[PDB]
Motif scaffolding. Structure first.
Motif, PDB file in Angstrom:
ATOM      1  N   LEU A 116      42.581  32.544  38.559  1.00 43.34           N
ATOM      2  CA  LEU A 116      41.282  33.136  38.877  1.00 43.34           C
ATOM      3  C   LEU A 116      41.402  33.966  40.147  1.00 43.34           C
ATOM      4  O   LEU A 116      40.884  35.077  40.203  1.00 43.34           O
ATOM      5  CB  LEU A 116      40.193  32.072  39.035  1.00 43.34           C
ATOM      6  N   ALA A 172      42.953  37.198  38.891  1.00 42.52           N
ATOM      7  CA  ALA A 172      41.935  37.832  38.092  1.00 42.52           C
ATOM      8  C   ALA A 172      40.900  38.589  38.875  1.00 42.52           C
ATOM      9  O   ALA A 172      40.483  39.713  38.553  1.00 42.52           O
ATOM     10  N   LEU A 173      40.472  37.921  39.922  1.00 41.15           N
ATOM     11  CA  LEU A 173      39.407  38.437  40.764  1.00 41.15           C
ATOM     12  C   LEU A 173      39.947  39.326  41.865  1.00 41.15           C
ATOM     13  O   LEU A 173      39.187  39.892  42.650  1.00 41.15           O
ATOM     14  CB  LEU A 173      38.590  37.320  41.406  1.00 41.15           C
TER      15      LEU A 173
END
Length: 11
Positions: free
Chosen positions: A7, A10-11
């Motif tokens: 994550l 991803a971010l």
């Protein structure tokens, strides 16, 4: 933690 890290990227 695997997901936490995924994550992060991803971010």
């Amino acid at each position: 933690a695997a997901l936490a890290a995924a994550l992060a990227q991803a971010l």
